[PDB]
């Protein structure tokens, strides 16, 4: 499979919350994972609040998943130690909690140590950079940073240095990553990413790599921009690893101001359509760019955000249908799969 063509991790995100995509329930899914990948990231059950039952830590479900990975030839990328969305915020993560810094420290110390020798790498901090298109806190940019509880409670971006230092100490073997989305656009956010990373280096913070989520569209951003944005980070240090963490490719772009080029029916690209062919080229050009811009030895891996199209968080987005992954509705490989195979080979 895919994993056999590369010398760095080729992973996929797995559902584990009941439903058709549940990894423990779908043997067809388990067979794809076993045949094509060598690493898995929990799509949801490893987020912050899932580590607790009320105010006590509860690792039962995540342990079941980590254990399944190990028995099925997969390493595990942890997503994520720190992240802002209220739906997954532990109950202590509040502006009213006077013990915030202590509870924050306990969180990192405990879960990083708990999984110490079973998790290969971690999204230590995820989505700390401000983003004009996703500011639920409503506070605006604080010098490029998103003003989440963590930023507020610590009075600045130092919560980031702390998370990394904390994680490194609890698990000296895990690769520590900063992860985020839109930083491949090569725009404002890319610039902020560069400053954030530079700051961390200057401070001697133990960061091992930078993850690019890569939630792109068939035609945006251009690979020329994706290339550069990756280049800029690669250039900041001689050892920093680059990891594509949540790759997926939408055939529909609802921000282009052209509604005439949108597939609005589930049947449009169920079998064959121009977008599916462009998606083969799109996946290909991206992996190629990764291979050419990131030096061997600095390759953290490429992870696709899901197994089959219907499992995708983008199966439907902006009220439009989409077919974002490598495997279709029937668990058959799509042209996107071939694009990956060709890029990884020759
Ligand atoms: O744990 C996981 C979470 O990490 C994950 O988080 C979501 C990640 O994606 C976020 O949404 C993104 C919002 O920004 C969009 O980009 C816009 C798109 O439009 C661009 O501008 C136009 C593009 O088209 C051209 O034609 C036109 O010329 C351009 O002007 C604009 O510049 C971009 O910034 C991304 O497409 C979205 O992915 C989302 O908010 C996060 O929640 O969610 C899953 C979870 O598992
Ligand atoms: Ca459109």
From Swiss-Prot:
This is Endo-1,4-beta-xylanase A. Pathway: Glycan degradation; xylan degradation. One of its GO terms (molecular function) is endo-1,4-beta-xylanase activity. The chain holds residues 265 to 610 of 611 of the full protein. The keyword Cell cycle does not apply. It catalyses: Endohydrolysis of (1->4)-beta-D-xylosidic linkages in xylans. Residues 17-343 form the GH10 domain. It is an enzyme of class 3 (hydrolase). Keywords: Carbohydrate metabolism, Disulfide bond, Glycosidase, Hydrolase, Polysaccharide degradation, Signal, Xylan degradation. Belongs to the glycosyl hydrolase 10 (cellulase F) family. Its EC number is 3.2.1.8. The active site is at residues 127, 246.
